[PDB]
Amino acid sequence: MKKITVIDSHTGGEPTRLVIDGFPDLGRGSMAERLQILEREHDQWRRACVLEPRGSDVLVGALLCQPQAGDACAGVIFFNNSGYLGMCGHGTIGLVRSLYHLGRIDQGVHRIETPVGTVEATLHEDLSVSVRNVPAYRYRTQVMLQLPGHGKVHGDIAWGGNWFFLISDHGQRIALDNVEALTHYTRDVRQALEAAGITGAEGGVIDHIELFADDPQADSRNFVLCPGKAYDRSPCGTGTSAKLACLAADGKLAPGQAWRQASVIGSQFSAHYEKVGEQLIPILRGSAHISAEATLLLDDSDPFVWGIGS
Template identity: 60%
Template sequence: NNVGVLNMCGHGTIGLAVTLAHLGRIRPGNHLIETPVGNITATLHDHHRVTITNVASYRYRAGVELDLGQEGRICGDVAWGGNWFFLAKDHAERIAYDNIPRLTAVTVAIRTALMRQGITGADGGEIDHVELFGPANDGADARNFVLCPGGAYDRSPCGTGTSAKLACLMADGQLQAGQTWRQQSIVGSIFEARGEWQGERVIPHITGTAHVNAESTLLFDLADPFCMGIQG
């Protein structure tokens, strides 16, 4: 994340597991990982594949209507999947890579409207992710565009966002427990997801791949006034 630490990151956890395997630190099997929102399990498979069993996810509010000013109005759900999301599928935007500037502008307007209207997650949690859905290609069930807290977009299908989406789909009876949902990202990558009920919440299982593409050595010279980064 370009503005700070996330509560949880699905694709980051998948990448972590593959990296640890590359370094010889872990073997295929289940591995418990502590995150700021609770412990999760990363199951390392063959061929760079990892399944994460995420924290319990749920829909907090359904059918939330926002006034976007000149952009009109939009209706969506507020859900938790390890981060707080506003998710909308009924919109006029084209979910495509060449439409990213427009998608960014609309999702920024959504996040601004959430703050202006005082809409939050449970216990006042900031809704700092916005997810728009549309038709997919490559046999996936949906394609998404996810705005992250710093205004950047998620190049993965978003593990926490897919978890939130599972919770909404299962709450509406549109997806059954154990049924696979294939989520495509704005760049075309795919997560396979399924959920199981735990009381009134959903335990998501998200499967994806990661590939190590560099081994680097970072040097921190204490004589460098910016060795720990540039801060305004």
């Protein structure tokens, strides 16, 4: 009956469902203001779009919006199985590659509005996309955490467009064949954070957990638990952004130096940061590929028209 028109893509294995038509009107405010309206009045639509049966727990959605600023090519709101994101590095790369597929933009530099500020994406001749993210920073370093299964760990708390807890001394094996244990470990970590009342700046909920390890073919490999407990198949743009701020603050990466980040499934991003005054600006480069052109159909007779689950 009701139709939602989408372009599905993935960035290093992590899917983006770009909604290009069919969602409710959210007005003409900022992306942040539109997010509030989307969540308050139309959250069932998020659930229809990305939850089973028409989506999956893994899926991240991106609502295409007309931006406020005249020099912006687009605005976007990102969401997942549990709620709403801030920025989304993999999804921005997906958005830009999808706009190109639609013939709406060409190669070159594009400004994209998001609920956490405007980012600048460059669509290259090889169709990869560089994202100049919002500023990233470390809020707290080596925060101690007691994990009943494993004992103490230390993690950094940092902002890369979403809030992250970053751990290196976890002692877990990071590989696709181990995502079940990795998922349980990171869930135990988030539980420990909540118990100890640990947050980011201004009580920011730390809803992403990332583990880092050495890799024979990159600078690092990671595992990232997302807010709704799915893992990120990509190297995580905002998560890697947070990582750059931590490396920089520890004296381990200077402006302009390349950092290659592999994901739990082996996909890679390249990144570096620039300094503009006091601010650290992460720049991520990766590729998205188109997965499908789809029209979701919302049957009013379907008991699960607005999604399965709690």
